[PDB]
Fold:
Amino acid sequence: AELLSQQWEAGMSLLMALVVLLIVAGNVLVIAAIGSTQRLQTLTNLFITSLACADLVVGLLVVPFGATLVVRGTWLWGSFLCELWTSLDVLCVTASIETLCVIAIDRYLAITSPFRYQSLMTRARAKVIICTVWAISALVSFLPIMMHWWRDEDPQALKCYQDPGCCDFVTNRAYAIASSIISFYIPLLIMIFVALRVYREAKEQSRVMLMREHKALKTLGIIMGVFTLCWLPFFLVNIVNVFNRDLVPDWLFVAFNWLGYANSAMNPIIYCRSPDFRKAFKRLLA
Ligand SMILES: CC(C)CCC[C@@H](C)[C@H]1CC[C@H]2[C@@H]3CC=C4C[C@@H](OC(=O)CCC(=O)O)CC[C@]4(C)[C@H]3CC[C@]12C
Ligand SMILES: CC(C)CCC[C@@H](C)[C@H]1CC[C@H]2[C@@H]3CC=C4C[C@@H](OC(=O)CCC(=O)O)CC[C@]4(C)[C@H]3CC[C@]12C
Ligand SMILES: CCCCCCCCCC(=O)N(CCO)C[C@@H](O)[C@@H](O)[C@@H](O)[C@@H](O)CO
Ligand SMILES: CCCCCCCCCC(=O)N(CCO)C[C@@H](O)[C@@H](O)[C@@H](O)[C@@H](O)CO
Ligand SMILES: CCCCCCCCCC(=O)N(CCO)C[C@@H](O)[C@@H](O)[C@@H](O)[C@@H](O)CO
Ligand SMILES: CC(C)(C)NC[C@H](O)c1ccc(O)c(CO)c1
Ligand code: NA
Structure:
């Protein structure tokens, strides 16, 4: 009884601390490696840094908070922090997929208009892109949440909003679909379309130089495909719930959300296909 709890509490607190550590280590590495290598300060990696910041925010803030909830069984941090926690969660996924769109666009341009691309893309402009992405993302995630557009009238819903120990995120059907379409599905579709255009013009192509490039593009390809596998199952279930809560077991809907959080750990590992990243990872770790 009370032993079964202690075992679970402490073993979970461990797995959580491990994930926290892996995300936070992995992404600090990426930021520092780009931060301390002129070789690796390309325009494209500015977008990678932005992406790794998003994952960093999942490691320091999203996952710790969510861990305390999973381990201890309730929300211990009050109303305001619960909403702000939810905000940051939605914020991160949105910035992540929007940054992936920028990256696929950056690559499409650089590959079919290398001349137009050169005279257009500068450092001051890649900064503007990155902030515009974070602004759009914060707009679409904070405001509806802090304005309670996500709330429902249900008895269950109000049971939970009054209770300070509840941080369930029970939303209405409108917010569920709007949020999914605006935060995930639309950028997901843009990023697919632009990723297959990029793959067309990739095949339709000094040989050593082109192999090294296509290695980098596949890396980016993997980045995207894995982000899509980690999140697509959750946003599919998010939708289907609105029409039928009986079609998918609750535990799996929770699982799928964690799979999402887990994606924050994967990019630094995947960037180990790069010799340049790998040399900077070792040099840094001292
Ligand atoms: C409290 C929550 C909402 C988190 C707040 C996150 C933002 C304030 C962070 C996340 C991504 C960051 C950006 C990620 C990458 C860059 C690239 C970087 O480009 C450079 O001009 C210097 C890099 C170089 O040339 O070596 C400047 C900071 C900037 C715009 C960062 C500005 C601040 C951002 C938008
Ligand atoms: C809210 C959801 C439904 C929209 C998801 C779309 C975004 C992932 C992408 C699509 C096109 C992208 C835009 C493509 C081009 C630009 C111009 C870009 O470059 C500059 O403005 C620099 C020029 C300067 O120096 O002033 C700023 C970001 C922005 C709006 C990008 C922001 C992110 C956008 C809107
Ligand atoms: C959750 C994130 C949400 C971001 C919050 C919105 C802020 C809007 C962006 C912004 O304030 N800037 C654009 C950022 O590019 C200002 C910068 O231009 C600033 O640094 C300037 O003072 C100098 O560039 C000029 O000397
Ligand atoms: C970018 C995110 C944008 C989401 C914005 C959607 C806001 C829609 C407003 C809304 O739907 N409600 C008001 C909340 O402001 C709640 C109602 O849906 C609900 O309370 C009842 O009418 C139920 O009985 C369902 O029919
Ligand atoms: C509210 C009750 C929720 C209780 C269940 C919480 C599950 C904890 C989530 C977690 O950390 N993982 C399970 C994820 O389902 C492990 C992941 O790190 C794992 O998926 C990845 O390591 C691999 O997929 C890739 O190597
Ligand atoms: C329920 C909990 C843990 C806050 N998950 C939120 C989930 O990660 C999520 C992320 C992004 C989104 O756009 C939505 C929209 O329903 C939900
Ligand atoms: Na509550």
Observations:
- Residues 86, 89-90, 93, 169, 176, 179-180, 183-184, 238, 257, 260 surround salbutamol (ligand 6) (CB under 6 Å).
